[PDB]
Write a protein that holds these residues in place. Structure first.
Motif, short mmCIF file in Angstrom:
data_model
loop_
_atom_site.label_atom_id
_atom_site.label_comp_id
_atom_site.label_asym_id
_atom_site.label_seq_id
_atom_site.Cartn_x
_atom_site.Cartn_y
_atom_site.Cartn_z
N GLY A 166 0.82 -1.22 0.00
CA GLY A 166 0.00 0.00 0.00
C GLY A 166 0.85 1.25 0.00
O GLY A 166 0.37 2.38 -0.10
N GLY A 167 2.16 1.03 0.12
CA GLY A 167 3.08 2.13 0.31
C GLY A 167 3.30 2.41 1.80
O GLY A 167 2.44 2.07 2.60
N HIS A 168 4.45 3.02 2.09
CA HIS A 168 4.99 3.29 3.42
C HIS A 168 6.05 4.39 3.29
O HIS A 168 6.91 4.32 2.43
CB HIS A 168 5.56 2.01 4.03
CG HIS A 168 5.77 2.02 5.49
ND1 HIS A 168 6.58 2.94 6.02
CD2 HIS A 168 5.42 1.36 6.62
CE1 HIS A 168 6.80 2.97 7.31
NE2 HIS A 168 6.05 1.95 7.72
N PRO A 169 5.93 5.44 4.10
CA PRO A 169 6.80 6.61 3.97
C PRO A 169 8.29 6.37 4.18
O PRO A 169 9.15 7.11 3.70
CB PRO A 169 6.26 7.57 5.05
CG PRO A 169 5.53 6.70 6.01
CD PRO A 169 4.92 5.61 5.17
N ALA A 170 8.81 5.43 4.87
CA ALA A 170 10.10 4.96 5.24
C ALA A 170 10.62 3.99 4.16
O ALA A 170 11.78 3.68 4.27
CB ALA A 170 10.13 4.29 6.62
#
Ligand code: SF4
Ligand code: SF4
Ligand code: F3S
Ligand SMILES: [Mg+2]
Lengths: 534, 267
Positions: A175-179
């Motif tokens: 889903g995506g992840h900022p890190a």
């Protein structure tokens, strides 16, 4: 929007064994940490009263990831206790199997244990394989084409569209992840090499079985040497050599370039998970009774003072139990060790782990690839210096960058490259020795009724020692002090945080529900909880 | 993690050294990548799964409760002393996890001597009260197929799974619940040194010319005659096995071998 509150990671996956990590977060950064090991087996208790020759068979089952290492440590320990000086060829064969273990172990750690903290496999489906091939061929002398990578993408695509994501279920990157920072192409390259490494590691492990009977859990060591007369033959040597050569090529052309590309994209990770103190035992002896005869030498460093490397004094090790689930609070030298379990539940009486807390002159010590590499560098080791410098120059960073999660990860690669080359040197010496007509692999010995012994191995995760007290020719006391015990054990009776605990202070956490930053640091130490607790 | 398509596998780790997990990674024709992408859906495995913590626990829940059903593969003994305290995952005792999960499986495979028979942590004096899966969960009617060894030949796990998928049943099992297709012969009857055994040609020591010459390792402790396994036939890593490496069999596919087969260098 920064989180303040606890985070618990239990289970910590993509390690060996059963680890619970507990942190306190304040304003999105870790302010406190606990390393909680939640399985005990009690191998030291079980060994009491047994035949010292049987110890290596039991202690090898400390751990199947770092298979062989404990058999080697126990055999070195009983060799030492017995006073036998094993033949030159037993030292070469034992060393060669150990070098092969390091290559297998570190390749699997980077790809199959660590990389999912940094690689979004599902974004590889978004990638342009022609672009990806260009990138891959630029970082490695190995040419990769668009078709090569499309084949991987097609396979992944079929896997993901079946809706059965298997080991990628609920991955922190979904889903995506900022890190997670990699672009799709780099994700595709890393994913392709993850898959490739699944088959290469078969060959890397096979190399151990050529001389060592089988992997996991080798069966070629005995007090006095080794048993594998077949290892003297040209055919077995050729077989080993071929597997070694292919494994080294993978290290050189696939693992290290990927390591460098990921490190370059995560250069902020030079700022987290540093530690103060380092211990290493040395490895690959010429003389079984002199650690300073080893290709990597032992040493101790406090507070990053690498200009003042201290000699390793084995009498300055004590294992604490004040914050462990054992009786009392008294630290013990392993020749006077005690393993008296007493469970109090999590933080009951301020106790929170089945690991003892080893301290050197009272200090918590990181061990493993970063310690081995930095101490070797600081001793003037020419191969370590050249690889380390090249890595630092490729990343555009200075030496201080090594004191970090990224640094530690890089050091694991450096050591793999240096050991992969050194295996060829040992192999040639071994051949040379055979060619002089030395065909001896085991020496005779006699069991003393009373003795003390110690065996030292620098294992893929660091300084391993096995300690025996023989009484009436039997095991009176047997104590293992294992690298992950040093690194991941709890606080001591001076309340000093262990290396993993201290390294976690400062960790940013973008999303408390998906705390990949904690995993990155914890995984960089390559924890082994069966090892650490035994 | 699963659904239709590929059969769901839930892989649990109890009191174990992860040598059994590593043995599966050595899978050869098929290799582990084929097994995870094509043959099976590996829906829980602490060693290699991406999720950790609560996310991993959610993955396990989703797998175990799937209406499609799952196969459980279990590594490690279950510590039962002090109400299971010596081994916890997600702050649940291993005994409790296995008691809840395994009765829900379509089939259970106990993989490695620890899972099958208790293993190294069950050796005297067994401080954690470690038990094999069928011993520990007898009361819940769990009857796992036991694939013994320390670790087992991964050929034997894949073969058992493939059989099961094909035939929708367990293969013939021996009285220790091990498949007779793999565990029906002693190591010894398959050993290349058997002619020396028959002739009473025994190595007296590891340094001896008899050992160099490949004589029988019985006097040096070999447990081949009392051990059921396929080691000399299949070998390990497509290349060797303990006696061909010059070392006695230690009996590692047999129950209680840590205590029955010791001292390892005596017969
Ligand atoms: S059966 Fe042997 S190899 Fe497998 S988990 Fe137990 S001790 Fe480790
Ligand atoms: S070496 Fe062991 S398995 Fe082989 S013939 Fe002798 S006793 Fe039997
Ligand atoms: S020790 Fe085990 S691996 Fe085979 S040769 Fe004996 S059953
Ligand atoms: Mg210990």
């Amino acid at each position: 929007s920064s989180y303040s509150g606890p985070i618990v990671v239990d289970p910590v996956t993509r390690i060996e064994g059963h680890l619970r990590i507990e942190v306190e977060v304040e304003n999105g950064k870790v302010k406190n940490a606990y390393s909680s090991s939640t399985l005990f087996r009690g191998l030291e208790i079980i060994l009491k009263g047994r035949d010292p020759r049987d110890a290596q068979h039991f202690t090898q089952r400390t751990c199947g990831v770092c298979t062989y290492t404990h058999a080697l440590a126990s055999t070195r320990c009983v060799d030492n206790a017995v006073g036998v000086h094993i033949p030159k060829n037993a030292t070469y064969i034992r060393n060669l199997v150990l070098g092969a273990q390091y290559l297998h172990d570190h390749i699997v750690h980077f790809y199959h244990l660590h990389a999912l903290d940094f690689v979004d496999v599902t974004a590889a489906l978004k990638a342009d394989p022609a672009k990806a091939a260009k990138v891959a061929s630029s970082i490695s002398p190995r040419k990769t084409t668009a078709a090569d990578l499309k084949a991987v993408q097609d396979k992944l695509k079929t896997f993901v569209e079946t809706g059965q994501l298997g080991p990628f279920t609920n991955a922190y990157f979904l889903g995506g992840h900022p890190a997670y920072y990699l672009d799709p192409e780099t994700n595709l390259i890393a994913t392709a090499h993850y898959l490739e490494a699944l088959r290469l590691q078969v060959k890397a492990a096979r190399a151990m079985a050529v001389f060592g009977a089988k992997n996991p859990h080798t069966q070629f060591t005995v007090v006095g040497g080794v048993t594998c007369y077949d290892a003297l033959t040209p055919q077995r040597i050729a077989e080993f050599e071929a597997l070694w050569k292919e494994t080294k090529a993978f290290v050189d052309e696939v693992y290290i370039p990927d390591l460098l590309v990921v490190a370059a994209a995560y250069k902020d990770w030079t700022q987290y998970g540093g530690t103060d103190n380092f211990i290493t035992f040395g490895e690959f002896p010429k003389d079984e009774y002199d650690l300073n005869s080893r290709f990597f030498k032992p040493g101790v460093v406090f507070k990053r003072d690498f200009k003042n490397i201290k000699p390793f004094d084995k009498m300055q090790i004590e294992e604490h139990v004040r914050h462990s689930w054992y009786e009392g609070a008294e630290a013990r030298h392993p020749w006077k060790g005690q393993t008296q379990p007493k469970y109090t539940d999590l933080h009951g009486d301020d106790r929170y782990s089945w690991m003892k807390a080893p301290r050197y002159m009272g200090e918590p010590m990181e061990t493993g690839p970063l310690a081995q590499v930095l101490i070797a560098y600081s001793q003037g080791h020419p191969k370590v210096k050249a690889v380390t410098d090249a890595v630092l120059a490729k990343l555009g960073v200075g030496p201080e960058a090594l004191f970090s999660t990224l640094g530690r990860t890089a050091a694991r690669g450096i050591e793999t490259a240096v050991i992969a080359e050194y295996v060829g040197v040992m192999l040639q010496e071994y051949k040379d020795n055979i060619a002089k007509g030395d065909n001896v692999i085991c020496a005779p010995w006699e069991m003393p009724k009373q003795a003390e012994g110690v065996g030292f191995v620098n294992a893929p995760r660091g300084g391993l020692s096995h300690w025996i007290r023989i009484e009436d020719g039997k095991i009176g006391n047997f104590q293992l002090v294992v690298p992950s015990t040093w690194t991941l054990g709890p606080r001591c009776d001076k309340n000093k945080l262990s290396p993993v605990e201290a390294s976690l202070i400062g960790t940013p956490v973008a999303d408390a529900k998906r705390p990949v930053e904690i995993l990155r640091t914890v995984h960089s130490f390559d924890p082994c909880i069966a090892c650490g607790v035994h | 993690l699963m659904g239709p398509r590929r059969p769901s596998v839930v892989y649990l780790h109890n009191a174990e050294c992860t040598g059994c997990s590593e043995s599966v990674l050595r899978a050869f024709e098929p290799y582990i990548d084929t097994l995870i992408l094509d043959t099976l859906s590996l829906d829980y495995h602490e060693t290699i799964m991406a999720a950790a913590g609560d996310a991993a626990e959610a993955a396990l829940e989703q797998a175990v409760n799937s209406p499609h059903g799952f196969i459980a593969v279990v590594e490690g003994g279950i510590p039962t002393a002090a109400n299971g305290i010596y081994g916890k995952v997600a702050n649940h005792t291993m005994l409790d996890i296995c008691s809840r999960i395994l009765p829900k499986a379509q089939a259970v495979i106990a993989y490695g001597t620890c899972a099958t028979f208790g293993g190294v942590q069950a050796a005297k004096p067994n401080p954690t009260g470690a038990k094999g899966v069928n011993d520990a969960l007898k009361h819940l009617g769990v009857k796992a197929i036991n694939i013994a060894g320390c670790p087992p030949n991964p050929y034997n796990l894949v073969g058992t799974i493939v059989y099961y998928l094909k035939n929708k049943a367990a293969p013939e099992l021996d009285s220790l619940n091990r498949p007779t297709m793999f565990f029906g012969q002693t190591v010894h009857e398959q050993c290349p040194r058997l002619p020396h055994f028959d002739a009473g040609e025994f190595a007296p020591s590891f340094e001896s010319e008899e050992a160099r010459k490949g004589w029988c390792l019985y006097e040096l402790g070999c447990k081949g005659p009392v051990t059921m396994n396929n080691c000399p036939k299949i070998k390990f890593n497509q290349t060797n096995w303990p006696v061909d490496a010059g070392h006695p069999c230690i009996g590692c596919s047999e129950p209680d071998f840590w205590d029955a087969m010791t001292p390892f260098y005596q017969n």
